[PDB]
Each structure stands twice: as C-alpha cells, then as structure tokens.
C-alpha cells in the first residue's frame, strides 16, 4: 500500500514551461527523500533531481541545472517538478521514486508509473497510408503509416482476424518532427491474389481511420 | 562577594568537581598561587585535592576535583569571583 | 560522470549463470545498486549497497563490488529474468546510471528474409519517396544494411526500426526507410539494398528499377 | 575560508560526504561511558558541510570531542573545549569563525561567561535550544545572549515534538530552523545517509547559513549576521499554540532561511522593581517599551543606552544597526498641564526614533508622567509615524514595505512584533515610528 502517483505530464512547445506531481501515499512523507528520474524513449535512465521534504534540501543534475526546480508540499504529501525553459531533448517518461530510507541516498526502492513529457514545435497531424506491394517460396506485403503527430496509433489487420506474422515496427521520428512506422505480414507467394489484405490504422488524437488494400503492380 | 553555583536540575549535577573562577584582572601567576593555596589549605583539613586544569586566555581560574566539604575554605580564598559545581551537558 | 556497463547486450538461455560488469567513475566504495526494467514498465530494485539483496528479490541475484569494478550475477537464469538491467552510482554528489544491459534469449541463429518495396503512386504524387527494405525473423539482432544506388553508399538519408524480440519464434525484424525528394529520385535506375548478416555466406542484395 | 568549529561527539572523518571538509583536532575531554560514538557528530558535520545534503556545501570544519558515546559531556569539558578554540585563535589565527555547540546542559554561569568572552572576540556562536520543551533560558549555552540559540521546527515549520517533550522556546531562542527527520551523513557506512531529529540539527542548519554568509562577506559582525539571520527568516509560520500562553509573546515566530546579498531592527525582551533589556555593543537603542500581564525609561549605562522598566514587567528594547549615528535621549519631567508632558528633538537633522513614558519629532505623554525621546542623526534617515485607532484587547499598526519599525507605543503594555506595533489592554490608538535609508 505504498505508492507514488504521477500526474501533470503531457505535450508542451519548445521554450515552454511544465509542472508535474508525485502523490505519495502509505508512508511518512517528510522522513524520506524523493527523486525524479527521466528516460528518453530509446535511451536509458537519467536522474534529474532529488528533495528531502522536511529539510527542503535539494540536489539537481547538471544537465537540468537552473531550468528545473523541485518543490514539496508536506501538507498535501506531494512532490513537484517545475520544468521551465524546456528543450527538445527533455522529451522523456518522468518517474518519481522514493529512497529506501537507509544506506546510500540514491537507493530507490519504490518507483512511480511514469508521466509522459513530449516537447516539440508540432501540431496534431493524421497519417497517410501507402502500400508495399510484392513483385517489383514466401512473399510478404505491408502498409506505411507515414507523417503524423503525436503518438500513438494501433495497426490491426482485418479488424482483429490476423495475429500471425504481424510485425508492427515501432514509430520512428523523422527530420520533419513527425512519426513513420512499418507494419507487415508474411504470406505465401501462391496466395498473392486469392486473399485480400487491408490494414486498419487507428490514430486516436486526430480521430482518423485510414484503411488501405495491398495489390501487386507491373514495374 | 564569592558565590557558589550548581545546576538547578539535580540529576545533572556532578559534585566533587568544581570550576573556580577568579576576578577578571587575575593573571596566570596568581591562579597557580590560588590553586596551590587551595590545595595547601585543604591538606591542613586532611582532605585530598587534585587540580585538574588551570584556565587562561578565556577565563581566569582552575578546575579542581575536591570534596564538597572544602567549599567554605575555597570561597574564602583570594581573587575568587565565584565557584560553580561541574555538571552534565547532552547531545541534542 | 561516466558509469560504464559491460556488455551492452548479452544473450543466454534459462539456467545459465549470467554476469554484468560495472565500472564507476571513481572509488565509490560499495555505493552501487542494480535495477531491472521490463519494456514498458517502471524499473525495479534488485541489489543495493553493492551486495545487499532487496526484499523479495529472488536469491538467484548476487552482487559483488570492490571500489571501481562491480558485478551483478544472475545464478540459474529464468524466463521472467529476461529484461534490461541498470547499474547505479549511488555515491554522494556524483550520481549516475549505467548505459543498461539487455539480457537476451539465445535461440538458433537463423538468416533473415529480405523484401524490397518501391514507393507507391499516391505517395510519389505528393513529391515524396520512401524506399522500404524489410528483413524478417533473424538472429542475432546484429545486421548491417547498406543502400547502393548504382554501386554507391548513402549518408544521412535512411532511418531504421527494429521489432522487440518475438515471444513465439523468438526472432527479430528490421524496417529501413531511405527518404528523398522526387527530383533526386528521377535521375537513377538501380536502388539496391546490400544486407549483411552472420548467417549469410554472401551479402544478399535486393534490387528493383524505376 | 570560513572555519566552523564543532564541539560534539567524535566524527567519522572518512565519511565520503564530509571527506577532507572536516579536520579532527587533538582535543578530547569526555566523561567515562563504536560507530555510535561518531553517529551524532558525523550527521551534524554532514548537515553543515555535506557534499550532497550540506547547507554550506564547501565549508571547512574542525571537530573537538566534548561528548562521550552516549553524547554525554561536562560543563568543564565544553569550557576547556572553547578555551582550546581561544588558544588556537591566538596561535594560527583563522578567518571568519563559527562555533557550533549542538548541546545542552542546565544553566551555567561559567559557560555563558565563556561564550560571551569568546563571542566578544568576534566569534559566531550557534547553539541548540534544547529538546526539553521548556524555556531555553534555563539551559546552557542556550540561555547565553551573545550566542545564537536555535529551536527546531518540523516539515510543516511547526515546533518539533520530541517524544513526550520537544523543542525549547522563550526569549532566549534567537530563531527556529528545521530539526525533524533531517537526512545527513550516517556513520553506518562511508556512503550512508540517515534521518535524525532535535535542536542540534536545527543549530547545525543555522550554523550552515551563518558559514554561507561569512563566505560571501567575511567582515560581518555577530550583530550584523544576527540581524540578517532574523530579517530573512520566514515570519509567522509557527502556530504559537504549541507554546505556553506565557512564553508565546517572548518566542520569535522566525523560521531560518538563506539571506541573499539598509536598516535592521530587532525586539529584545528582558526577564520579569527594575528590568533591563540591552542592545549589542555595535547596536543602537532606537526605542524602549514595557509590558505586564496585568497593569518605561531609556537610561545610560557605561556609555551605552538601556531600556529600563519599572508582579513584574518586561523591558522591551528595540535594537538597531544604524551606521554612523549620533544618538541622544532627552527627558522632560511631568508638566501637570491639560495639554500633556512634551519633549522634542530640538536639533536639526536629528530625527525621533522612539518614545518612552514612565511615572512631528515630539513625544506626548500623560500630565503626571516623565517623557523620554530617542533622538538620532544618521546619513539620510527618514522617520514616518503611522497610527491606528479602533473603538478592546489588541490593536496593530505596521510599517510599509521599505520602512523599519524603530519605535512602538500606545497613545495616552505595548511591543513590536517584527515590523508590526502591538498595544495590549482588556478609542485604542497604537503609534509606530517607521525609519528609512
């Protein structure tokens, strides 16, 4: 019954400001130290800053020095991270974790679920589906969920009928500031024509459902 | 003119040990005379005395481990401003 | 402050004695910790104070550590043990984490299935080209993909994407996207995709024409 | 540059958080009784000069063992200890000096004496108020006046309740600082941390803020450092209820905070017939008042003015840091006329800072009472008068943000709460004098 509830996270523009919250339950708040550990998608764990609620004592990461500021409301049992002068690199899953209470100060026994912080100069965009036809033993074919913002998007094949061979690759951020992913399924070269294949793209932010069939060409 | 002093909180008292503070202008040469004088006068009453420390730079005086029976004799000594009975101090 | 984990990825099977090296930025005493994060989950504490086994963390888990060099030891590896492991420098002022170690499942060492796909008409009409070069189910995750246009290398124009290790066949897949303008596209014939893997005798190339 | 002398238990010198920061001196004087011996001391050294958790993160420290393994010392031990410091101060004279006494004994005539003699040598003495939930004035070095006495506050800036007891209070407590569940260097291991409570923690915190201040300005006086420690402390954060009604007025509602880097004033209460409330040697008395639970004069004493009050009454002095000031007190005896008893700062450029009544730039008292006026001259000293009347128990008048209260009074007891003048009874007009740069 010990938990660190994480809230406040979302989308913000570069140079902007953002406030986050860490709701501590099931333990003497003042007694412990609370840290913030962020993590960029493909990257590892980076400790950003800590606090000791009774003392009010803090320490930050040189990376985040002067921009981010930890505060703690002992009355409301909440730890906050004020993220001003935000950069693009600051895009990460923000975790808050409590100190084990003994030994080395950075020992984080309990961690929160994480709150997503996305920071870029981009406005909500829907993707445009493009087919990947065979013949330019086994011959695959797929779709191309290209240029969209933010995240996520579900790629189901024939409204939850085809689970086998469905390799829906992770979304990749382009030099444009938009995502591009791939979703494919391996099918026999004999079946190319006899069976129909349509990918159901589900971009929830823009509320768009683009369904496209995959048929072969000549050259 | 010479006053005895002890801790108000009785369990904190450490009798048998006393800090003898002399008047402001008293210099080291006299503190040693006064300690010898105390030791000597106390020897006459058949009491054993041990001068622990002789103060200077911060205060004029000495720290003495002696019987509480010698305080009458001790306050009557020259240069003595006041005598305090050593007590206990604690980590907070 | 640089804290280095070795290896960046190790592959082994259930029951094996797994070991992960850790080099602290300086003599950090026993001020080390080990954390386990599963994809999409928050990290979980395993070892602290270099050798102390945190409550409920299976006895499989061992922690060794001098002053600079430290080592996590997963005696008799398990299916739920297949995860990403972080080192932690819990030393005053200088606090860091290691790069992370992915404890990978070793399988059979199988060759990929390469599939080249040219850009669609509806996409090329908007003035954008996307050259797709697939790779289906392979081991190791290690593979080098080149883009040869009339036998010439390409720099700063292709982005890759790897699927997270399969549960079924337990194998990897790759989707490299070479993106360029329609103007630079209408001046070339061959768009070869030289794929190099360990389970390949000769580097298999997939080509098409405009 | 700022050396912080620590007289406590032994310290775990090695501890990676205070390594090379602290120096262990060859002084030991502890009464007869292993990691637990370093415990209290190490944690405090961490609180002061800690690399991660320290207030004055860089600060150089020096430790003297005066407490044993159960943190029990002697008045003599401490005395000899402070003497060691005085003797070392004469051998290789160190820069700005802060002396940390995170300890408490009963009231000691000799220790307060030792502390004052050492403080007069320009040494900043910071001490714990005591964890006995009592008037600090009954403990030493707590009761000492030249020593900065520190009470402990919890996470909600309220007073620490230590077991069945808690933080000490009273007119001897200079200010309050966090002293509950403090994370600092733990002797359990070279890299271990722990949460400890008590007024020691509070003292150590302030000792750090003091060290910080002298790093920035080594020439600061104890009186200057005190006034600033008061000025930049968080005000009215403590719910006065935790203290006895008796001790509430006397207890400062200050919670220590780092002063960033002008006229500073402070209220000085006396002990309960004549009562005397005195200012620091480099401080000027700009006002005097008094108070009784039921129902005052500014006199000279050894070339320095003092607030004198006539069950018992408290002499309430207003002590200020007024650079280059020619101050004088002019007194006019009872006139017995219906107009009243009057006195004015007849000189030019000489402003009225405060009034004192006992039985523009003018004091008006009752016909039967003698009237005293505080007339000061300082480079560019403006002095407003703010009044407040209501048709009661307590009326309050306060200086505007930029004005320092120099003198609180009741129009014919009364006292100054920070920059607020309070008048107490059972139209009630309160008079405050506000002065400026």
Describe this structure in words.
The complex is a heterotetramer of chains A (219), B (92), C (210) and D (437). Chain A is built from no helices and 19 strands. Chain A is elongated and about 75 Å long. Chain A starts with a strand and ends in a 6-residue tail after the last strand. Chain B is α+β, with helices and mostly antiparallel strands. Chain B has one domain: Peptidase S8 propeptide/proteinase inhibitor I9 (Alpha-Beta Plaits, 2-Layer Sandwich). Chain B contains two helices and five strands; from the N terminus they run E-E-H-E-E-H-E. In chain B, strand 3 and strand 4 form a beta hairpin. With 437 residues, chain D is an alpha+beta fold. Chain D folds into two domains: 264 residues, Peptidase S8/S53 domain (Rossmann fold); 173 residues, Jelly Rolls (Sandwich). In chain D, helix 1 packs parallel to helix 4 and helix 2 runs parallel beside helix 3. The longest helix of chain D is centred in the middle third of the chain and has 18 residues.
What is the element layout, followed by pairings?
The complex is a heterotetramer of chains A (219), B (92), C (210) and D (437).
Chain A: E1 3-7, E2 11-12, E3 18-25, E4 34-39, E5 46-52, E6 57-60, E7 68-73, E8 78-83, E9 92-99, E10 108-111, E11 115-119, E12 128-129, E13 141-148, E14 154-157, E15 167-168, E16 172-173, E17 179-185, E18 198-202, E19 211-213
Parallel strand pairs in A: 2-11
Antiparallel strand pairs in A: 1-3, 3-8, 4-5, 4-9, 5-6, 7-8, 9-10, 9-11, 12-13, 13-17, 14-18, 15-17, 16-17, 18-19
Chain C: E1 4-6, E2 9-12, E3 18-23, E4 32-37, E5 44-48, E6 52-53, E7 61-65, E8 69-74, E9 84-90, E10 95-97, E11 101-105, E12 113-117, H1 121-124, E13 128-138, E14 144-148, E15 158-159, E16 172-181, H2 182-185, E17 192-196, E18 205-206
Parallel strand pairs in C: 2-11
Antiparallel strand pairs in C: 1-3, 3-8, 4-5, 4-9, 5-6, 7-8, 9-10, 9-11, 12-13, 13-16, 14-17, 15-16, 17-18
Chain D: E1 3-8, E2 22-28, H1 39-49, E3 60-65, E4 72-74, H2 75-91, E5 97-101, E6 103-106, H3 109-119, E7 124-128, E8 139-140, E9 148-153, E10 175-178, E11 182-186, E12 192-196, H4 199-216, H5 222-231, E13 234-235, H6 245-248, E14 254-255, E15 264-268, E16 275-277, E17 284-291, E18 297-300, E19 305-309, E20 314-321, E21 326-332, E22 341-344, E23 351-358, E24 362-365, E25 370-377, E26 383-390, E27 394-398, E28 404-410, E29 414-417, E30 420-424, E31 428-435
Parallel strand pairs in D: 1-3, 1-5, 2-3, 5-7, 7-9, 9-10
Antiparallel strand pairs in D: 6-8, 11-12, 13-14, 15-20, 16-19, 17-20, 18-19, 21-25, 22-24, 23-25, 26-31, 27-30, 28-31, 29-30
Helix pairs in contact in D: 1-4, 2-3
PDB class: hydrolase
Keywords: immunoglobulin proprotein convertase, subtilisin, hydrolase
Assembly: tetrameric
